């Protein structure tokens, strides 16, 4: 196993030249520096570690280093350089896995003054250097101040323009931090046993003799990096074709909403000063004094003035128009600013910045696009589809396949409660109408009330919120929950074993529950440490971890089987991963025939995961074929 | 009419002579299925069909043009396609090692003509006959086609022998009549559908008998088609 980190001229989007790179080999216990005229030998040294059957350690390698050296080897040396996933390790990925929390631990490091506040909780290489005591300085700062003591000014992102011996020295500096952070991650005896040097071993022994979560996260991070490079095709004209229908409506409404109110329907310090003059008495306030002015209360605001009352719905539309504009046409997001020259949006994704499960998406958040049930969402969802590019060569309309996890949340509960009811509740899922059973069990009037109950009750809603479902308060809530526990004993006993797994005894002392903690981490499905939580609720943490870890393995096995079936991944191939959303995925497909294979494969892949972890409940998927996202869901 | 052919005889014959170097590895890939899929992975071809046209051309001594024209090129593209397949399938390379060096002592080029010192200018067939070749640069094509032709020859003999032994009479006046033998497939006339069904089963029974007879390392199978004519039997 060798440890490295590289230095290029810019990001992966427009990287042109390779500057330097250092390779520390543990068998020789000595570093090796590479220069612009040594890029060829650098690629050979990495291939040699692959030929021996070892491993290559990069920081942010799955997302940057490895794909950039594939791109850089194509334009500079014109060679096919491709690192296999199995022979690659990303310290950044393990850091987010092993140190998913840090929130706690970083507090003392912050109190110590050993961590910059700008580098709080960051998994960046420099952020970890201060944590381990290996930061002698940063290349960006020893460059800025040294440009002063030389003359020339500074450009926001110019320290990577040209190769200099100080970068070569700080390139080594990034490797020794990568090395020390790697060893800091290998010293956690819950993911890596106390065997031997896990550097000394080959990749075949590495993945299997390590905790399973280690392997999944590197397969997930490798897979998601491909999806970002694939990107999600974007119809610029269509979204532009939305802005006037919103902006003209915004301008026309603003005119009408200034004739009703003389001398901005967008701020809370505005309407509070205005609406409290038309006779509206705020019922619910906020923890800072100001009254609540959300969608809920506005629907119920009643004023004697007919014009003011009718103007409320015009404010309701205004805020929503601003919302769509504020998501589709604003500044520094808006999708329209993120459209790359290939007509696609490359939305980034953090493998699992959320302790339990489900990645985080940003620049732009591809997971918060308005659904087809929300206003103007039909047009918005239509703007996302594989139909925006009809094949990279053949001109063949690419069709989209959208596959989601059928009621994954409730099925995860049946598996963990199958420990107390012997597959009873799991069979009620298969029999169908689990919301009908929960309705009978909790004695609710309508099935829809049971649907919003089972999720609310499971996820820690108070007795008022439960009572407010049927139009009541905490009175009906307590009896609605107590009745459900009696009719479904397994759920109640489930919340016992959990409450007695992380607590020894609890006690209230002047405002704080003083739990005598037995463990501050629930074991997941792969064996990982899953957050710490704090109070009585925890079941929500267990279920969302199960489903997302199911989906993570699901989307990996799906792509693995599709590749195993011969289907090439990419826009120049048969399919391309475009988006992963919670329990659903959107996959571009070159032909309808291929799209059918994707749907069937996703269902078949769902069985390996369900079989692997011996899930007591049946995992299933449903696929929808069509041009865009408004059709596939 | 009953049309029965030898299911992929060429590739299974290759598995038999290379089972001497891989201990039945490649042979099981035939039975497990999708051998053209493995050859596709081994030689790094984009489509399975490209692997099919590859395996036959490479085995029989095709240069690089037919190979290069697969990807839209010339004689240039071919060497890396052939060498990569050799690295991923050592047994095939090892197959041409011991056998091709079983017929030579040392070779020598004289004025552009290889004046190879031979051990014997003839490869032994499945029944000890002399099967000569020409150049030791390949010869494998001669070896495989010799196995296949000798397999079918015995195959059509035992099939008729078993059919006669079971009670069937040969000819237009009996129950069945051989109409044409085409290398790895045969066309047999049958008086009734019932006789044709027996013909199909017997041919498979004879094909397994041949494999046990010469202790063939790979498994031989056949497929039959019943119908009125030849367009139906194939």
Give the helix/strand layout.
This is part of a larger assembly, with two copies of chain A.
Chain A (H helix, E strand, L loop, with lengths): L1 E7 L9 E8 L4 E5 L4 H14 L3 E3 L2 H15 L12 E3 H8 L4 H10 L12 H8 L6 H10 L16 H22 L16 H7 L2 H19 L1 E2 L2 H24 L8 H8 L19 H6 L5 H23 L15 E2 L2 E3 L9 E3 L14 H6 L16 E7 L2 H14 L2 H8 L2 H9 L4 H12 L4 H5 L6 H14 L1 H11 L8 E2 L2 E2 L8 E2 L5 E2 L8 H26 L10 E7 L2 E6 L2 H21 L8 E6 L7
Parallel strand pairs in A: 1-4, 4-5
Antiparallel strand pairs in A: 1-2, 2-3, 6-7, 8-9, 10-16, 10-17, 11-12, 13-14, 15-16
Helix pairs in contact in A: 3-7, 5-7, 9-22, 10-13, 15-16, 15-21, 15-22, 17-18, 20-21, 22-23
PDB class: transferase
Keywords: Replisome, transferase
Entry title: Crystal Structure of the T7 Replisome in the Absence of DNA
Tell me about this structure.
The structure is cut from a larger assembly and holds two copies of chain A. With 633 residues, chain A is of the alpha+beta class. Chain A has four domains: 1-232, Nucleotidyltransferase, domain 5, CATH 3.30.420.10; 233-343, Taq DNA Polymerase, Chain T, domain 4 (Up-down Bundle); 344-406 and 519-633, Alpha-Beta Plaits, CATH 3.30.70.370; 407-518, DNA polymerase, domain 1. Helix content of chain A is 47%, strand content 11%. Chain A has helices at residues 39-52, 61-75, 91-98, 103-112, 125-132, 139-148, 165-186, 203-209, 212-230, 236-259, 268-275, 295-300, 306-328, 377-382, 408-421, 424-431, 434-442, 447-458, 463-467, 474-487, 489-499, 539-564, 592-612; strands at residues 2-8, 18-25, 30-34, 56-58, 88-90, 232-233, 344-345, 348-350, 360-362, 399-405, 508-509, 512-513, 522-523, 529-530, 575-581, 584-589, 621-626. In chain A, helix 5 (125-132) packs across helix 7.
